[PDB]
Design a protein around this ligand. Sequence first.
Ligand SMILES: O=C(Nc1c[nH]nc1-c1nc2cc(CN3CCOCC3)ccc2[nH]1)NC1CC1
Length: 274
Amino acid sequence: VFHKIRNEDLIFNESLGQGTFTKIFKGVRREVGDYGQLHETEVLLKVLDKAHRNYSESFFEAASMMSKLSHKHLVLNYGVCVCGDENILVQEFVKFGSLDTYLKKNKNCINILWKLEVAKQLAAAMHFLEENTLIHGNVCAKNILLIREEDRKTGNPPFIKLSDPGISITVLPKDILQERIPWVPPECIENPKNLNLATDKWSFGTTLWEICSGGDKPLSALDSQRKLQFYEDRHQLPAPKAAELANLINNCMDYEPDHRPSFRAIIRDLNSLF
Ligand SMILES: O=C(Nc1c[nH]nc1-c1nc2cc(CN3CCOCC3)ccc2[nH]1)NC1CC1
């Protein structure tokens, strides 16, 4: 499992946000680096809520997966802080935060080139998970982290990474399973044991919607009840103004899991644009 990192070396700084039953902070780690050097490294500290500690098994196994593989688009895990009454994951601090809020805050300066480049990097990471027969389970723009911006003054591209899935939808309560419509695929609302590789093909389609909709949240005007009726009337998401990917979004968000294209195919289609 995890490298154990002592409390004496971690220093909690500013709240950066929250996830599902989790508090997320910028931090500082003291450590001996390469050549016996001493570093004080910026980290990310993710605390499992005090009330929801019973979820700690899924909370840590979800991070356990990312640390079992190694790929340039997967977020690095440094270890777990050892306190006592706490569950703290220490992870790679990414300077530019969530694609989620980056898209909102930059909604007007994103040409479909920048979008397409980020989608290719995301499919690459999802294709690597697919060949390893490994389920993520929570592909959403808020689980995507921006290592590097475009540098509009050179021709460099952005570079993103993919973070933890967090607590499994296997165990979360149903009210929590139903606001993440349309990220949770329709079979998993039926019963979360429908979790399969095919889950990520649906959710990737929803993230593709988010990336094109300047950070709107799909179906944000609907409450839970209506979100369920969205799936029972088997509707689709509307096509974004930026519409070049509306077909790919729909092919990915297929109501039959066995028909969702492989990420091999998703990449090829994604590459066939000018
Ligand atoms: O939410 C997460 N955030 C991070 C993981 N590693 N590094 C981060 C992270 N890094 C962050 C950095 C900022 C500061 N910048 C302010 C303006 O420019 C953009 C962000 C804010 C929030 C940030 N979160 N991780 C998992 C998906 C739930």
